[PDB]
């Protein structure tokens, strides 16, 4: 009954914490996918 | 003790997954820092 207090109040935290780490994931992810279609398009102007 | 294994099992898995999704975080990042790098391959190369 004392570890479970333990436990379960440190997996609230943790799980809230799974909330903003994955928000900077997608937009870690968001800005590759800026890159990349900024460096097709500097790309087409090379050809052109 | 069935409530414990149980949340301690919860447990296991998230601080883990915590630590599986920054790990895709910095493979989404080092993407951009390979899709930018590349770039200035071609910019300079215009700029020339």
């Known amino acids: 009954s004392a570890a479970k207090r ?14 903003e780490l994955l928000n900077e ?7 590759a996918k800026k890159a990349m279609v900024d460096a097709a398009r500097l790309a087409d102007e090379l050809r052109a």
Chains 1, 2 share one sequence.
């Open 25 to 31: 994931a997608k937009n870690s992810e968001e800005k």
């Open 6 to 19: 333990k436990l379960e109040g440190e997996l609230q935290t943790l799980h809230a914490d799974l909330d």
